[PDB]
Protein backbone atom coordinates (compact mmCIF):
# COMPACT_ATOMS: atom_id res chain seq x y z
CA UNK A 1 0.00 0.00 0.00
CA UNK A 2 1.68 3.21 -0.94
CA UNK A 3 -0.40 5.10 1.69
CA UNK A 4 0.88 2.94 4.12
CA UNK A 5 4.75 3.91 2.41
CA UNK A 6 3.91 7.22 2.40
CA UNK A 7 3.48 7.27 6.50
CA UNK A 8 6.59 5.49 7.39
CA UNK A 9 8.53 7.75 5.13
CA UNK A 10 6.94 10.48 6.88
CA UNK A 11 7.70 8.93 10.25
CA UNK A 12 11.77 8.16 9.25
CA UNK A 13 12.46 11.41 8.30
CA UNK A 14 10.91 12.79 11.31
CA UNK A 15 12.75 9.83 13.74
CA UNK A 16 15.84 11.44 12.11
CA UNK A 17 15.16 14.89 12.63
CA UNK A 18 14.47 14.27 15.93
CA UNK A 19 18.18 12.77 16.77
CA UNK A 20 20.25 14.76 14.40
CA UNK A 21 18.32 17.87 13.71
CA UNK A 22 16.70 19.31 11.07
CA UNK A 23 19.51 20.20 9.40
CA UNK A 24 21.14 17.27 9.30
CA UNK A 25 18.04 14.70 7.84
CA UNK A 26 20.28 12.92 4.70
CA UNK A 27 18.43 10.36 3.33
CA UNK A 28 18.73 7.60 0.86
CA UNK A 29 18.34 8.61 -2.54
CA UNK A 30 18.68 7.25 -6.66
CA UNK A 31 22.37 8.00 -6.23
CA UNK A 32 23.28 7.67 -2.21
CA UNK A 33 22.64 4.68 -0.21
CA UNK A 34 22.00 6.05 3.31
CA UNK A 35 21.26 3.20 5.90
CA UNK A 36 20.34 4.24 9.56
CA UNK A 37 21.20 1.77 12.46
CA UNK A 38 21.38 2.02 16.45
CA UNK A 39 17.85 3.51 17.16
CA UNK A 40 19.02 6.46 14.62
CA UNK A 41 22.75 7.47 15.83
CA UNK A 42 24.78 5.59 13.67
CA UNK A 43 24.31 6.10 9.76
CA UNK A 44 26.14 4.77 6.76
CA UNK A 45 26.58 6.64 3.79
CA UNK A 46 27.62 5.18 0.02
CA UNK A 47 27.71 8.54 -2.43
CA UNK A 48 28.03 6.76 -6.08
CA UNK A 49 28.61 9.91 -7.74
CA UNK A 50 31.58 10.52 -5.68
CA UNK A 51 32.89 7.35 -4.86
CA UNK A 52 33.20 7.83 -1.06
CA UNK A 53 31.66 6.31 1.97
CA UNK A 54 30.60 8.59 5.03
CA UNK A 55 29.75 6.56 8.31
CA UNK A 56 28.33 8.96 10.62
CA UNK A 57 27.82 8.39 14.71
CA UNK A 58 26.02 10.86 16.96
CA UNK A 59 25.57 8.43 20.35
CA UNK A 60 27.36 10.44 23.50
CA UNK A 61 28.24 6.85 24.61
CA UNK A 62 31.24 4.94 22.97
CA UNK A 63 31.56 6.34 19.33
CA UNK A 64 34.46 4.47 18.21
CA UNK A 65 32.16 0.68 18.63
CA UNK A 66 29.18 2.51 17.23
CA UNK A 67 31.59 3.61 13.70
CA UNK A 68 33.19 0.03 13.78
CA UNK A 69 30.02 -1.71 13.69
CA UNK A 70 28.63 0.39 10.95
CA UNK A 71 32.28 0.50 8.86
CA UNK A 72 32.74 -3.71 9.11
CA UNK A 73 28.86 -4.45 8.00
CA UNK A 74 28.94 -1.72 5.19
CA UNK A 75 31.97 -3.07 3.83
CA UNK A 76 31.01 -6.99 3.84
CA UNK A 77 27.18 -5.73 3.20
CA UNK A 78 25.88 -8.48 1.04
CA UNK A 79 24.31 -7.03 -2.70
CA UNK A 80 20.64 -7.26 -1.66
CA UNK A 81 18.54 -4.60 -2.65
CA UNK A 82 15.16 -6.99 -2.16
CA UNK A 83 15.71 -7.43 1.39
CA UNK A 84 16.78 -4.32 3.08
CA UNK A 85 15.14 -1.34 4.33
CA UNK A 86 16.69 1.87 4.07
CA UNK A 87 13.67 3.63 5.72
CA UNK A 88 13.92 1.82 8.84
CA UNK A 89 16.74 1.55 11.51
CA UNK A 90 16.39 -2.03 11.78
CA UNK A 91 19.60 -3.53 11.45
CA UNK A 92 19.12 -6.38 8.71
CA UNK A 93 21.39 -9.25 8.85
CA UNK A 94 23.54 -8.91 5.33
CA UNK A 95 27.08 -10.11 5.72
CA UNK A 96 28.19 -11.56 2.63
CA UNK A 97 31.31 -13.88 0.96
CA UNK A 98 31.03 -11.66 -2.05
CA UNK A 99 30.51 -7.91 -0.92
CA UNK A 100 28.55 -5.47 -2.96
CA UNK A 101 31.54 -3.01 -2.35
CA UNK A 102 33.93 -6.01 -2.90
CA UNK A 103 36.71 -3.96 -5.80
CA UNK A 104 35.08 -0.88 -5.41
CA UNK A 105 36.99 -0.10 -2.09
CA UNK A 106 40.23 -1.19 -0.88
CA UNK A 107 41.98 -0.72 3.04
CA UNK A 108 44.53 0.97 4.02
CA UNK A 109 47.20 -1.81 2.19
CA UNK A 110 45.44 -1.27 -1.14
CA UNK A 111 43.43 -4.82 -0.80
CA UNK A 112 39.84 -5.78 -1.42
CA UNK A 113 37.70 -7.06 1.49
CA UNK A 114 35.43 -9.49 1.63
CA UNK A 115 36.17 -10.83 5.56
CA UNK A 116 35.68 -9.90 8.32
CA UNK A 117 39.45 -9.47 9.84
CA UNK A 118 40.65 -7.36 7.26
CA UNK A 119 37.53 -5.18 7.42
CA UNK A 120 38.35 -4.81 10.75
CA UNK A 121 41.34 -3.93 10.61
CA UNK A 122 40.77 -1.37 7.99
CA UNK A 123 37.95 -0.33 11.04
CA UNK A 124 40.80 0.95 13.93
CA UNK A 125 43.07 2.26 10.52
CA UNK A 126 40.02 5.23 9.83
CA UNK A 127 39.22 5.51 13.94
CA UNK A 128 42.91 5.80 14.85
CA UNK A 129 43.97 8.09 11.86
CA UNK A 130 40.83 9.58 9.94
CA UNK A 131 37.99 9.98 12.52
CA UNK A 132 37.08 13.63 12.48
CA UNK A 133 34.65 15.47 14.55
CA UNK A 134 31.93 18.30 14.12
CA UNK A 135 28.98 19.78 15.65
CA UNK A 136 25.37 19.91 15.35
CA UNK A 137 25.43 23.11 17.34
CA UNK A 138 24.53 20.89 20.03
CA UNK A 139 26.18 17.35 20.20
CA UNK A 140 29.08 16.30 18.36
CA UNK A 141 29.26 13.94 15.32
CA UNK A 142 31.86 11.42 14.64
CA UNK A 143 32.53 10.24 11.14
CA UNK A 144 35.34 8.44 9.01
CA UNK A 145 35.29 9.13 5.12
CA UNK A 146 36.31 6.37 2.58
CA UNK A 147 37.10 7.18 -0.71
CA UNK A 148 36.14 4.60 -3.48
CA UNK A 149 38.90 3.19 -6.15
CA UNK A 150 38.93 5.35 -8.80
CA UNK A 151 37.41 3.19 -11.15
CA UNK A 152 34.49 2.58 -9.01
CA UNK A 153 31.62 3.12 -11.33
CA UNK A 154 33.06 0.77 -14.20
CA UNK A 155 33.77 -1.90 -11.73
CA UNK A 156 29.54 -1.28 -11.00
CA UNK A 157 28.80 -0.83 -14.38
CA UNK A 158 30.61 -4.42 -14.88
CA UNK A 159 28.19 -6.31 -12.84
CA UNK A 160 25.01 -5.52 -15.12
CA UNK A 161 26.93 -5.62 -19.19
CA UNK A 162 25.44 -8.87 -19.05
CA UNK A 163 22.02 -7.61 -18.85
CA UNK A 164 22.58 -4.52 -20.85
CA UNK A 165 23.79 -6.64 -23.47
CA UNK A 166 20.59 -9.37 -23.40
CA UNK A 167 18.36 -6.37 -23.29
CA UNK A 168 19.64 -4.52 -26.47
CA UNK A 169 19.56 -8.12 -28.46
CA UNK A 170 15.84 -8.59 -27.21
CA UNK A 171 14.44 -5.12 -27.69
CA UNK A 172 16.39 -3.42 -30.16
CA UNK A 173 17.57 -0.88 -27.73
CA UNK A 174 21.72 0.31 -28.44
CA UNK A 175 23.70 -0.88 -25.13
CA UNK A 176 25.34 2.98 -24.93
CA UNK A 177 22.00 4.07 -24.89
CA UNK A 178 21.12 1.77 -21.82
CA UNK A 179 24.33 2.15 -19.70
CA UNK A 180 24.35 6.23 -20.27
CA UNK A 181 20.42 6.11 -18.68
CA UNK A 182 21.07 4.29 -15.92
CA UNK A 183 24.73 5.49 -15.08
CA UNK A 184 22.95 9.03 -15.26
CA UNK A 185 19.64 7.92 -13.54
CA UNK A 186 21.15 5.89 -10.66
CA UNK A 187 25.17 5.89 -11.12
CA UNK A 188 24.58 1.73 -11.21
CA UNK A 189 22.86 1.57 -7.46
CA UNK A 190 20.95 -1.07 -6.77
CA UNK A 191 19.41 0.24 -4.17
CA UNK A 192 18.40 3.32 -6.03
CA UNK A 193 14.98 4.82 -5.29
CA UNK A 194 13.76 8.71 -6.17
CA UNK A 195 11.40 10.76 -4.16
CA UNK A 196 8.76 10.27 -7.66
CA UNK A 197 8.98 6.82 -6.90
CA UNK A 198 11.97 5.80 -9.45
CA UNK A 199 12.90 2.27 -8.59
CA UNK A 200 16.30 0.32 -9.12
CA UNK A 201 19.19 0.87 -11.79
CA UNK A 202 17.17 2.02 -14.25
CA UNK A 203 14.93 4.19 -11.90
CA UNK A 204 11.35 2.96 -13.23
CA UNK A 205 8.19 4.32 -11.94
CA UNK A 206 6.03 1.58 -11.50
CA UNK A 207 2.57 3.10 -11.85
CA UNK A 208 3.66 5.25 -15.26
CA UNK A 209 6.50 3.27 -17.86
CA UNK A 210 6.29 0.64 -15.67
CA UNK A 211 2.66 -0.32 -16.68
CA UNK A 212 3.06 0.51 -20.07
CA UNK A 213 5.91 -1.65 -20.56
CA UNK A 214 3.47 -4.54 -18.76
CA UNK A 215 1.11 -3.25 -21.74
CA UNK A 216 3.26 -4.20 -24.66
CA UNK A 217 3.95 -7.67 -23.01
CA UNK A 218 0.64 -8.63 -22.88
CA UNK A 219 0.21 -8.44 -18.81
CA UNK A 220 -2.22 -6.35 -16.93
CA UNK A 221 -1.72 -4.57 -14.00
CA UNK A 222 1.89 -3.45 -12.44
CA UNK A 223 5.21 -4.29 -11.85
CA UNK A 224 6.17 -4.93 -8.41
CA UNK A 225 8.82 -3.48 -6.60
CA UNK A 226 10.61 -6.51 -5.78
CA UNK A 227 10.23 -7.46 -9.74
CA UNK A 228 12.11 -3.74 -10.28
CA UNK A 229 14.51 -4.33 -7.35
CA UNK A 230 16.16 -7.28 -9.61
CA UNK A 231 18.09 -5.91 -11.63
CA UNK A 232 17.91 -7.84 -14.64
CA UNK A 233 14.01 -7.48 -14.71
CA UNK A 234 14.78 -3.33 -13.97
CA UNK A 235 16.74 -3.83 -17.00
CA UNK A 236 14.91 -5.21 -19.39
CA UNK A 237 11.55 -3.17 -18.23
CA UNK A 238 13.70 0.02 -18.74
CA UNK A 239 15.00 -0.75 -22.32
CA UNK A 240 11.24 -2.02 -23.08
CA UNK A 241 10.05 1.43 -22.24
CA UNK A 242 13.02 3.32 -24.24
CA UNK A 243 11.98 0.44 -27.10
CA UNK A 244 8.18 1.43 -26.60
CA UNK A 245 9.05 5.78 -26.81
CA UNK A 246 10.82 5.20 -30.20
CA UNK A 247 7.96 3.03 -31.57
CA UNK A 248 5.04 4.19 -30.35
CA UNK A 249 4.94 6.96 -28.18
CA UNK A 250 7.66 9.29 -30.58
CA UNK A 251 7.32 7.01 -33.35
CA UNK A 252 5.87 10.30 -35.65
CA UNK A 253 9.64 11.86 -35.31
CA UNK A 254 11.20 10.92 -38.39
CA UNK A 255 14.73 11.75 -37.95
CA UNK A 256 16.40 8.81 -35.92
CA UNK A 257 18.80 11.53 -34.32
CA UNK A 258 15.80 13.62 -33.23
CA UNK A 259 14.07 10.91 -31.80
CA UNK A 260 16.37 9.92 -29.89
CA UNK A 261 16.63 13.49 -28.09
CA UNK A 262 13.12 13.15 -27.98
CA UNK A 263 13.09 9.82 -26.09
CA UNK A 264 16.02 10.44 -23.67
CA UNK A 265 13.78 13.46 -22.82
CA UNK A 266 10.80 12.06 -22.48
CA UNK A 267 11.90 8.74 -20.62
CA UNK A 268 12.95 11.31 -18.00
CA UNK A 269 9.57 13.25 -18.35
CA UNK A 270 6.83 11.40 -20.11
CA UNK A 271 6.17 11.45 -23.92
CA UNK A 272 3.89 14.27 -23.82
CA UNK A 273 5.53 16.80 -21.81
CA UNK A 274 8.29 16.45 -24.59
CA UNK A 275 5.95 16.53 -27.47
CA UNK A 276 3.88 19.74 -25.61
CA UNK A 277 7.24 22.03 -25.95
CA UNK A 278 6.13 22.28 -29.53
CA UNK A 279 2.46 21.79 -29.61
CA UNK A 280 -0.32 20.98 -27.57
CA UNK A 281 -1.58 18.84 -30.66
CA UNK A 282 0.68 15.40 -30.22
CA UNK A 283 0.25 15.48 -34.50
CA UNK A 284 1.51 19.21 -34.94
CA UNK A 285 3.76 18.71 -32.15
CA UNK A 286 5.48 16.08 -34.26
CA UNK A 287 5.19 18.04 -37.93
CA UNK A 288 6.84 20.57 -36.00
CA UNK A 289 9.68 18.32 -35.23
CA UNK A 290 9.97 16.79 -38.13
CA UNK A 291 10.34 20.64 -40.00
CA UNK A 292 13.70 20.98 -37.70
CA UNK A 293 17.32 19.92 -38.00
CA UNK A 294 17.90 17.63 -34.92
CA UNK A 295 20.39 20.19 -33.14
CA UNK A 296 17.51 22.43 -33.19
CA UNK A 297 15.89 19.63 -31.72
CA UNK A 298 18.40 19.22 -29.11
CA UNK A 299 18.69 23.02 -28.45
CA UNK A 300 14.57 23.68 -28.24
CA UNK A 301 14.48 20.72 -25.25
CA UNK A 302 17.42 21.23 -23.12
CA UNK A 303 16.27 25.49 -22.89
CA UNK A 304 13.03 25.50 -23.19
CA UNK A 305 11.65 22.04 -21.67
CA UNK A 306 9.31 23.13 -18.52
CA UNK A 307 11.44 20.78 -15.94
CA UNK A 308 15.16 21.68 -14.84
CA UNK A 309 15.88 18.08 -14.57
CA UNK A 310 14.80 17.26 -17.72
CA UNK A 311 16.76 19.67 -19.47
CA UNK A 312 19.98 19.00 -17.77
CA UNK A 313 18.89 14.97 -18.24
CA UNK A 314 18.95 15.63 -21.95
CA UNK A 315 22.00 16.97 -21.68
CA UNK A 316 23.44 14.50 -19.52
CA UNK A 317 22.91 11.62 -21.05
CA UNK A 318 23.89 12.72 -24.05
CA UNK A 319 27.10 12.79 -23.21
CA UNK A 320 27.74 10.01 -21.56
CA UNK A 321 26.07 7.91 -24.59
CA UNK A 322 29.44 8.82 -26.20
CA UNK A 323 31.31 7.08 -23.91
CA UNK A 324 29.96 3.96 -24.04
CA UNK A 325 29.18 4.33 -27.79
CA UNK A 326 32.84 2.91 -28.75
CA UNK A 327 33.46 -0.84 -28.22
CA UNK B 1 19.15 13.16 -5.94
CA UNK B 2 18.50 11.88 -2.82
CA UNK B 3 12.87 10.26 -0.02
CA UNK B 4 9.92 8.54 -0.65
CA UNK B 5 6.40 10.43 0.35
C1 LIG C 1 18.49 12.26 -8.51
O1 LIG C 1 19.62 12.05 -8.87
C2 LIG C 1 17.40 11.99 -9.55
C3 LIG C 1 17.71 10.72 -10.24
O2 LIG C 1 16.03 12.01 -9.23
C4 LIG C 1 15.31 12.71 -9.91
C5 LIG C 1 15.22 14.12 -9.30
N1 LIG C 1 14.73 15.27 -9.77
C6 LIG C 1 15.50 16.44 -9.59
C7 LIG C 1 16.85 16.43 -8.93
O3 LIG C 1 15.08 17.46 -9.97
C8 LIG C 1 14.27 14.04 -8.12
O4 LIG C 1 14.64 12.93 -7.30
C9 LIG C 1 13.73 11.86 -7.56
C10 LIG C 1 13.05 12.31 -8.85
O5 LIG C 1 13.03 13.70 -8.71
C11 LIG C 1 13.94 11.97 -10.06
O6 LIG C 1 13.25 12.15 -11.34
C12 LIG C 1 12.34 11.25 -11.75
O7 LIG C 1 13.14 10.36 -12.66
C13 LIG C 1 12.31 9.32 -13.35
C14 LIG C 1 12.98 8.55 -14.48
O8 LIG C 1 12.83 7.16 -14.25
C15 LIG C 1 11.04 9.94 -13.93
O9 LIG C 1 10.24 9.00 -14.67
C16 LIG C 1 10.31 10.57 -12.84
O10 LIG C 1 9.01 10.93 -13.28
C17 LIG C 1 11.10 11.75 -12.46
N2 LIG C 1 10.35 12.65 -11.56
C18 LIG C 1 9.62 13.68 -12.28
C19 LIG C 1 10.17 14.54 -13.44
O11 LIG C 1 8.33 13.84 -11.69
Known amino acids: ?3 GFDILMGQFAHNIENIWGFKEVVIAGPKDYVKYTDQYQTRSHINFDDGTITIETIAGTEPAAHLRRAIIKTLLMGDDPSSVDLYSDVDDITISKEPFLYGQVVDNTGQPIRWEGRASNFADYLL ?5 SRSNGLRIIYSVTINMV ?3 LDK ?7 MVRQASRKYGVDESLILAIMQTQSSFNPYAVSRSDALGLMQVVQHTAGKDVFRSQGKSGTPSRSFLFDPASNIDTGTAYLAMLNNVYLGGIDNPTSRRYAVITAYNGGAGSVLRVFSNDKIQAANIINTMTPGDVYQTLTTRHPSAESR ?16 | AXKXX
Open chain 1, 1 to 3: DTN
Open chain 1, 128 to 132: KNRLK
Open chain 1, 150 to 152: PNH
Open chain 1, 156 to 162: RAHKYLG
Open chain 1, 312 to 327: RYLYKVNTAQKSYRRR
